[PDB]
Amino acid sequence: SIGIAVILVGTSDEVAIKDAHEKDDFHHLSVVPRVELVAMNETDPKSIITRICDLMSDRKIQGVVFADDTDQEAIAQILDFISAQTLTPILGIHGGSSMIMADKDESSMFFQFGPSIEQQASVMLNIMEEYDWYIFSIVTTYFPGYQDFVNKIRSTIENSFVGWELEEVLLLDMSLDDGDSKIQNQLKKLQSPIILLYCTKEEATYIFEVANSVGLTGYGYTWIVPSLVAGDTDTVPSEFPTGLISVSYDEWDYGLPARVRDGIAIITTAASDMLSEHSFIPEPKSSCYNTHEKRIYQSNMLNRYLINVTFEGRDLSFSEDGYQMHPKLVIILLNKERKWERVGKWKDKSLQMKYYVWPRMDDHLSIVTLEEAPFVIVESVDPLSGTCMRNTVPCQKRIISENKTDEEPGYIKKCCKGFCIDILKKISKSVKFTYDLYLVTNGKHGKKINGTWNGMIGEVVMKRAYMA
Amino acid sequence: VKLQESGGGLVQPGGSLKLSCAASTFSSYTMSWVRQTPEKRLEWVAYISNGGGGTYYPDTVKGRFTISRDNAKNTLYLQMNSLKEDTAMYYCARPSRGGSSYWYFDVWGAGTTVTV
Amino acid sequence: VNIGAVLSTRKHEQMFREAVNQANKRIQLQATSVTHKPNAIQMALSVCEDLISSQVYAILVSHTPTPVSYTAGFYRIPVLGLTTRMSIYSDKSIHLSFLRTVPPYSHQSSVWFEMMRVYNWNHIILLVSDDHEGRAAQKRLETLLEERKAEKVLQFDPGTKNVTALLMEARELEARVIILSASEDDAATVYRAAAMLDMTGSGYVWLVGEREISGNALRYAPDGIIGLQLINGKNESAHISDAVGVVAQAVHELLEKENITDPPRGCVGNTNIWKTGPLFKRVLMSSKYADGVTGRVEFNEDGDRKFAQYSIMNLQNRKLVQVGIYNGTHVIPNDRKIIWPGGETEKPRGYQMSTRLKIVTIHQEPFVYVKPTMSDGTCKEEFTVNGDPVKKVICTGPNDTSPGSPRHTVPQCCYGFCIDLLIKLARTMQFTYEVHLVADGKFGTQERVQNSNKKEWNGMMGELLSGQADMIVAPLTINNERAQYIEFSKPFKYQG
Amino acid sequence: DIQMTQSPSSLSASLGGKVTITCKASQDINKYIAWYQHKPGKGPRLLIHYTSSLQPGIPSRFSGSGSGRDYSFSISNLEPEDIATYYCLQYDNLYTFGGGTKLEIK
Amino acid sequence: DIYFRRQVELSTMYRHMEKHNYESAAEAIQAVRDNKLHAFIWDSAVLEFEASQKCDLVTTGELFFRSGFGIGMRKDSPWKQQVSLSILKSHENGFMEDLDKT
Structure with missing residues (x-):
């Protein structure tokens, strides 16, 4: 006998959603919860309020779940209104993002389900920190979450980033603007390649009209924006270029019925009896018109308990601004036919990328070397970052293994120093170069046996696009 | 899905008779069953959740009763000890809408007797 | 067109509709019914009992105004001025746009900053409670400081229970100017603890914000308090009249433009973002007015009036007499005879030149030694190789006597190179001085702490920055990073 | 746990009369009600839900009202x-x- | 640590420095004589005194970062013109030569 709201989505399978949650055995905790389904598909504020507090007036309701299709603003802030008006816990939402910003003061609320915008920026650095490729651009249009975003990527890009170049670029606001005028002055600086900003889908279609007008669409560039602008769903216009990779947390998240079970478990596990030090009996609210001063003592004890609760290998927790504390993460998705194909999974801090090189990127060379005396020194990697600072060279060494699987060009990129590497870093700037540096495997460098050559000359005679 | 009881008896006065009720999806479905008085009262006997936890009784038969269930064979297990003054009929009842919570069944069993 | 309303004063609703017939000279208008209740939730229900006829209108009314800035900011419904003094309601992150008429509580920033140039330069310790109401004013006054010097600021969010410690620390600091911007119960709390500390008396107390006059505060203040008050800020009839005036000027100006399409008349079936919302924001943000009944009102980026006229008051302990007026540039009064209890001479600046200084040192031989004392407090008198008296001073040693976890401070005894040079400088320059050792012993450096964007200074130099001392006499090198804001001297020696 | 007590002891009526039996629990129930009927030796048949919601296959012969406990x-x-x-x-x-x-x- | 962290060409040396640092001067001075630490980097105005009393260690010559220890004051205190004079006066009439001779 606890009151749990449902999900009102105008499409889905409420049977799988019912069945998923009803196998979580919440005994050994205090009373057992319950569910009551209803549905709506309209997205105005008034229908939302007169349904939420109608259900509040009928049932002794503890908490509220909600998700409709893919509208973020048409839910957000309205929820912060009803939560602070009712002093009752409310789950995080699907069908809009539960993200972009829980900016109001959660001293009477708190609802959320999602990674923070900075945990997304940290994993966005570690992803581009898998191969090369330091932070290029700055967020140009006005996110409301801009000054924290840039002051966190600035405050981490200096005290712990492995030799990064400058950011000659700033923030404008082309909403009040007449058109393509000040966006023309920012398309010059904007060097190569870049990082895209946080904007809207319609205004991305706008800024891509300006970028197509100047010539930034092809041109050898890539673009990272973490999903919230254009990748909200499986729908994209054809005016998006094939460089427009983007990371989210979700293709198997909230909408899943096991996620629904997880959401049921977070509110329900935080029992009043589980609060053994403060065995208080919750007196739920009557209706959405009064009884707001009765929860002054109850909700503060509840605010401390939602953070790290233990579950059945699914320890979900929230920050003060409502995020995880180990959020569910996905990798960047890319394709070229209207374009999101899945490439990855991230949990704690791992990446386990599907390829060790980015496809779609002649002056690209492979170069094969050998570890030896004062010429090419091979040392191990940093145990916190993987890359190399002074060396700044992959040296993707292959492993010889059992004769049932191929070699390992995903073995960890051992540092390579010496005198020839310092020569190579000058010879690259002398004309125009691009490395693909890797080691020999048979270990028979500079040998001619009966018929053939081995080692570095062995990979010379096999015409493998080489230097030595 | 249908429920059929078995294991009926009170052949020892004050003994222990493990009765059962098999089902033919019952794994996500909790269980609680019923004895009947000579005044026919559908008094409760025991309580399990669907997941084996939540082992409880009402105040009539507390202190003597050993409780289990098996969702593989879709069966319950509880030995009747303090029905020794009754000529009761027992049936099994599977509450609707599943879960470790409880709702209103139409999914009841068949009905068998327990006699001293 | 009609005109929505939120109840506040009934006869003001009568005169606005009477004023609409006046505004009919510019494109015809009417007004609708008005409602306000004690239930915020309900009033959020009854927004589209008024928004059904909101296909081409704007309305925002004063008295918290919380459920209406969010509702009529959904469909991009243009929101106008009112009577608010909070700061969450001027932010391009909470709501879209809702012009303003009265300047906020923090927005009286520059009347103080301009007062310094009116009399004499001052140094300001600024007391501010821990809320946005004050962090905004701090940021604004630091943006004013970053033009063309302030001691420190404090934190007192929940300050209403024996908060004399904070005021006890400001007594030690060298500052006679107090800036206090808090609530009236916090004003009745600081006035208690300063009277017990005699800072109401021989000290000075400067009295910021409009939340210091009204409330128990005027029961609890001495003669000579200076407060501020805006011109006609409680004449709400003058507000509703200038409201109907600035909308009558805005309607004729907006109706003459193109792409004048209107939002729908349904209130429970809309889902789109109506594109004439930004055109309404554009025509309102550029609406400079000639004159009304409230003085000339123009508009800033926050939709405030920016040209508010502020009335300068003073308490002669029998009435708050107003002495002068404000107009962007302050008008210089002439009946302004500012008192202090005090008498009349203690009105200008007045800085207390301290003669007792606090010195921080570190253990570094052969420059500065550290020795435990004898059993009677006074340490061992010794002699040199020549039999000369080794001049020592009693350094206050650390609490962390032994690098572990114990925190016990003891009188130790110190001597050496820097000690002798400090002796000569103190005899030369008339210094009363105390010497206490450093907290940890890491010579001062810079790093990013508290996992954010704050870089504080560890160790000794942080104790110089935080006001724990006033001179550093130690082997402290000269670097580019320390000399960013710390002035040095000719450096004793030359080494590498 | 909470225990209930129904009352009283009888459904003495003719063909088409009217009897009414009361749910009385030790604690507030908020209209948590069901109703079952059975022969001696046959097995129960559901009648009534939350708002006295009858069952398909059960006629309109059965109604009820009440609240709280x-x-x-x-x-x-x-x-x-x-x-x-x-x-x-x-x-x-x-x-x-x-x-x-x-x-x-x- | 500021001088080493500032330079880019010495960065690998700084990366070798992070795993063995100490917290005070006397810890490393005692640790050099216990053969746990083959070398140490500090000021000359401490090591030339230490090489005259604890008579087992030696310096090795050249200098890198030539500066001098100065009096640290708060910014724009009014003593900034007095103490910059009297120090020079103490460098003129032979006071500091008596001080370091003592």
Whole structure:
């Protein structure tokens, strides 16, 4: 006998959603919860309020779940209104993002389900920190979450980033603007390649009209924006270029019925009896018109308990601004036919990328070397970052293994120093170069046996696009 | 899905008779069953959740009763000890809408007797 | 067109509709019914009992105004001025746009900053409670400081229970100017603890914000308090009249433009973002007015009036007499005879030149030694190789006597190179001085702490920055990073 | 746990009369009600939900009203296939039951 | 640590420095004589005194970062013109030569 709201989505399978949650055995905790389904598909504020507090007036309701299709603003802030008006816990939402910003003061609320915008920026650095490729651009249009975003990527890009170049670029606001005028002055600086900003889908279609007008669409560039602008769903216009990779947390998240079970478990596990030090009996609210001063003592004890609760290998927790504390993460998705194909999974801090090189990127060379005396020194990697600072060279060494699987060009990129590497870093700037540096495997460098050559000359005679 | 009881008896006065009720999806479905008085009262006997936890009784038969269930064979297990003054009929009842919570069944069993 | 309303004063609703017939000279208008209740939730229900006829209108009314800035900011419904003094309601992150008429509580920033140039330069310790109401004013006054010097600021969010410690620390600091911007119960709390500390008396107390006059505060203040008050800020009839005036000027100006399409008349079936919302924001943000009944009102980026006229008051302990007026540039009064209890001479600046200084040192031989004392407090008198008296001073040693976890401070005894040079400088320059050792012993450096964007200074130099001392006499090198804001001297020696 | 007590002891009525039996629990139930009927030796048949919501296959012969902890349930127009005994269920804590009554025909 | 962290060409040396640092001067001075630490980097105005009393260690010559220890004051205190004079006066009439001779 606890009151749990449902999900009102105008499409889905409420049977799988019912069945998923009803196998979580919440005994050994205090009373057992319950569910009551209803549905709506309209997205105005008034229908939302007169349904939420109608259900509040009928049932002794503890908490509220909600998700409709893919509208973020048409839910957000309205929820912060009803939560602070009712002093009752409310789950995080699907069908809009539960993200972009829980900016109001959660001293009477708190609802959320999602990674923070900075945990997304940290994993966005570690992803581009898998191969090369330091932070290029700055967020140009006005996110409301801009000054924290840039002051966190600035405050981490200096005290712990492995030799990064400058950011000659700033923030404008082309909403009040007449058109393509000040966006023309920012398309010059904007060097190569870049990082895209946080904007809207319609205004991305706008800024891509300006970028197509100047010539930034092809041109050898890539673009990272973490999903919230254009990748909200499986729908994209054809005016998006094939460089427009983007990371989210979700293709198997909230909408899943096991996620629904997880959401049921977070509110329900935080029992009043589980609060053994403060065995208080919750007196739920009557209706959405009064009884707001009765929860002054109850909700503060509840605010401390939602953070790290233990579950059945699914320890979900929230920050003060409502995020995880180990959020569910996905990798960047890319394709070229209207374009999101899945490439990855991230949990704690791992990446386990599907390829060790980015496809779609002649002056690209492979170069094969050998570890030896004062010429090419091979040392191990940093145990916190993987890359190399002074060396700044992959040296993707292959492993010889059992004769049932191929070699390992995903073995960890051992540092390579010496005198020839310092020569190579000058010879690259002398004309125009691009490395693909890797080691020999048979270990028979500079040998001619009966018929053939081995080692570095062995990979010379096999015409493998080489230097030595 | 249908429920059929078995294991009926009170052949020892004050003994222990493990009765059962098999089902033919019952794994996500909790269980609680019923004895009947000579005044026919559908008094409760025991309580399990669907997941084996939540082992409880009402105040009539507390202190003597050993409780289990098996969702593989879709069966319950509880030995009747303090029905020794009754000529009761027992049936099994599977509450609707599943879960470790409880709702209103139409999914009841068949009905068998327990006699001293 | 009609005109929505939120109840506040009934006869003001009568005169606005009477004023609409006046505004009919510019494109015809009417007004609708008005409602306000004690239930915020309900009033959020009854927004589209008024928004059904909101296909081409704007309305925002004063008295918290919380459920209406969010509702009529959904469909991009243009929101106008009112009577608010909070700061969450001027932010391009909470709501879209809702012009303003009265300047906020923090927005009286520059009347103080301009007062310094009116009399004499001052140094300001600024007391501010821990809320946005004050962090905004701090940021604004630091943006004013970053033009063309302030001691420190404090934190007192929940300050209403024996908060004399904070005021006890400001007594030690060298500052006679107090800036206090808090609530009236916090004003009745600081006035208690300063009277017990005699800072109401021989000290000075400067009295910021409009939340210091009204409330128990005027029961609890001495003669000579200076407060501020805006011109006609409680004449709400003058507000509703200038409201109907600035909308009558805005309607004729907006109706003459193109792409004048209107939002729908349904209130429970809309889902789109109506594109004439930004055109309404554009025509309102550029609406400079000639004159009304409230003085000339123009508009800033926050939709405030920016040209508010502020009335300068003073308490002669029998009435708050107003002495002068404000107009962007302050008008210089002439009946302004500012008192202090005090008498009349203690009105200008007045800085207390301290003669007792606090010195921080570190253990570094052969420059500065550290020795435990004898059993009677006074340490061992010794002699040199020549039999000369080794001049020592009693350094206050650390609490962390032994690098572990114990925190016990003891009188130790110190001597050496820097000690002798400090002796000569103190005899030369008339210094009363105390010497206490450093907290940890890491010579001062810079790093990013508290996992954010704050870089504080560890160790000794942080104790110089935080006001724990006033001179550093130690082997402290000269670097580019320390000399960013710390002035040095000719450096004793030359080494590498 | 919470325990219930129904009352009183009888459904003495003729063909098509009116009787009403009350759910009385030790604690507030918020209209947590059910109603079942069975022959001696046959097995229960559901009647009533939350808002006295009847069942498809169950006629409109059964109605009721009440709230909080006290509920009344009325039976009329009874055909003598309902030689039964009527029982009320509460589930605030895990399950709750009382005495209940049996039906006789005079 | 500021001088080493500032330079880019010495960065690998700084990366070798992070795993063995100490917290005070006397810890490393005692640790050099216990052969746990083959070398140490500090000021000359401490090591030339230490090489005259604890008579087992030696310096090795050249200098890198030539500066001098100065009096640290708060910014724009009014003593900034007095103490910059009297120090020079103490460098003129032979006071500091008596001080370091003592």
